[PDB]
Design a protein around this ligand. Structure first.
Ligand SMILES: [Ca+2]
Ligand SMILES: [Ca+2]
Ligand SMILES: [Ca+2]
Lengths: 333, 336
DNA sequence: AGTCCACCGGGGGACT
DNA sequence: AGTCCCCCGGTGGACT
């Protein structure tokens, strides 16, 4: 659970344990001795808790400590079982904390989307926890999916085939050079009509059990191929902490997205943002005031709309609701 | 020395030691116990050796092992002075291995420039180690300076004042809409030597090795040229990355695009050449990534790539020979 | 198996 | 001293 429990740890099958011993079954060209089972860690710490949608304590807790908890719980476990020998590289923690930050924040935006869709479709405005009821006029057409995009993804595959296609007429008359596309961590797309009546988009999850991990993370498949170009509503990049070299992959990808979607496909301004918990060198805010490169060719707006620093789980959800309430005003009911 | 020597180690002052014990002098907020004194490590390991201009053995050694040498020598020192007590973090070794790849590679390119500028000037093509003589037509106006750019630099400061104003008026324009176009830095720039300096000799002298004094000469060199380069005269930008990961390719890609927009797009310069070097690409992804077309002039202009090449130097000789080749080609549309 | 992907935190030094 | 900069290697998991 969120608070460590000697009882629940002793009760885990060895395969569900948060630390895995691999000393006597090692990985080629790796001296890793103990592995951080991040999926188990999600299962154990957020198995029943989705920050911002649980207890008042959790929701308004410092989000840093919320995202820190699994690795803390894992470290406690490891010391219980392997008192002298428990050792994990700082880079094991860095990798896991980054993914847990992406996954949990994507899980908070799932439950928002769900609550929001429920309102849009003519069910209530759910109130546990209480959150400002949106003032937008409901319509099943204003629903949204929140897609935690996977590693190795290409975002152009979200687009409907007509549009993958106009991004190749242009791409074709352009090749030893090309123009590849990568991925935001997360995209918020307008729900496609086909799916506007399906129930899975209105159901909040109770926790990041393995099957709920799978539900959220496979969700992009369902939408591959069915999203129009002005219907990609937000892109997010999660970086837990910042360093000045680690800023540029979102800034590049926002520019490319903007060049293709706005210039070669006619979408409105592509809203792209970055979430961090530790911006240190506030260079970062000034760096993300960068003009969109493509737009300085035409006749202008930002490439990255905002560096956002969430204080609490619940703040994440206020902002995203406020977003939807504003942004889906565009879309017709 | 390049290979570890207990006597060279014993003669070091304590301030020159490759490992510094800070166990009773902790850094605020930091649990570091021993620091990798990287300037010291460059002096110890490379103080008398600039790869590619040294023994045929070193010059043809795998460049990975050449660049890994300072950390190794430092770990040996550590093991000597501190035995089982000696611990350094992986991240310390990574930080310093990276800087060492930028610093040493730039010294290889510094010596290449010295040799090249001698030829260009009416002096010779110095013969050891044998490198194929360039065929370009010699001229003093074809000399180049190799600038190791520092942390936190803004390459725009290299340019002549008249070109910085063109760039300032533009961003004045952006500012009035709550936008900027920040510029940062590649790791290294090869600039055409300005005329004021085409008769100065420091640019024609090869260094013996990376003693502190030469470390300073090379890393200070950019101050001598600030405010004096014309847009057309930035002639090669290089980003060094000892090893790649997919997320770590985008700083040079992004800054190449901002360099291009501004040099090409706002100051009529030619295609700005910008390459990335690496000893460890972990596959083929990074090569396809670096075929991205430069973005501003995708939006009445010849299209070209943002980053001209991802180069993977196998040996230091190869780095020297590739840069000599480059200059031979590239330095033509400067009139002699 | 191997091979790819992209996570980020502990750093040495410049500058103040 | 205190603050900032830009360095990269060891990772857990998806895929085959
Ligand atoms: Ca990310
Ligand atoms: Ca470590
Ligand atoms: Ca670099």
């Amino acid at each position: 659970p969120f608070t460590y429990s000697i009882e629940a740890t002793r009760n885990l099958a060895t395969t569900e344990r948060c630390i895995q011993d691999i000393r006597n079954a090692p990985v080629r060209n790796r001296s890793t001795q103990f592995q951080l089972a991040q999926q188990n860690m999600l299962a154990y710490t957020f198995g029943e808790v989705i920050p911002g949608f649980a207890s008042a304590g959790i929701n308004g807790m410092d989000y840093r400590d919320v995202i820190g908890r699994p690795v803390e719980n894992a470290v406690t476990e490891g010391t219980h079982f392997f008192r002298d020998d428990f050792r994990v590289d700082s880079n094991a923690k860095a990798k896991v904390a980054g993914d847990i930050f992406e996954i949990v924040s994507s899980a908070v935006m799932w439950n928002c989307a769900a609550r929001w869709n429920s309102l849009m479709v003519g069910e209530g405005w759910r109130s546990q926890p209480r959150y400002s009821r949106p003032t937008l006029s409901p319509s099943p057409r204003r629903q949204v999916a929140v897609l935690n995009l996977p590693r190795s993804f290409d975002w152009v595959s979200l687009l409907v085939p007509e549009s993958q296609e106009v991004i190749e007429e242009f791409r074709a008359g352009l090749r030893g050079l090309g123009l590849p596309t990568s991925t935001p961590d997360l995209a918020v797309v307008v729900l496609p009509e086909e799916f506007q009546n399906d129930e899975m988009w209105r159901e909040e999850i109770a926790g990041l059990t393995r099957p709920n991990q799978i539900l959220l993370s496979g969700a992009y498949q369902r939408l591959q191929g069915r999203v129009q170009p002005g219907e990609i509503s937000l892109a997010v990049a999660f970086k837990r902490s910042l360093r000045s070299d680690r800023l540029y992959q979102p800034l590049y990808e926002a520019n490319v997205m903007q060049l293709l979607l706005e210039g070669k496909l006619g979408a409105p301004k592509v809203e792209f943002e970055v979430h961090t918990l530790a911006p240190e060198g506030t260079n970062a805010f000034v760096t993300y005031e960068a003009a969109s490169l493509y737009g300085l060719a035409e006749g202008v707006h930002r490439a990255i709309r905002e560096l956002y620093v969430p204080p609490t789980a619940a703040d994440l959800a206020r902002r995203f609701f406020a977003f939807l309430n504003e942004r889906m005003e565009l879309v017709n009911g």
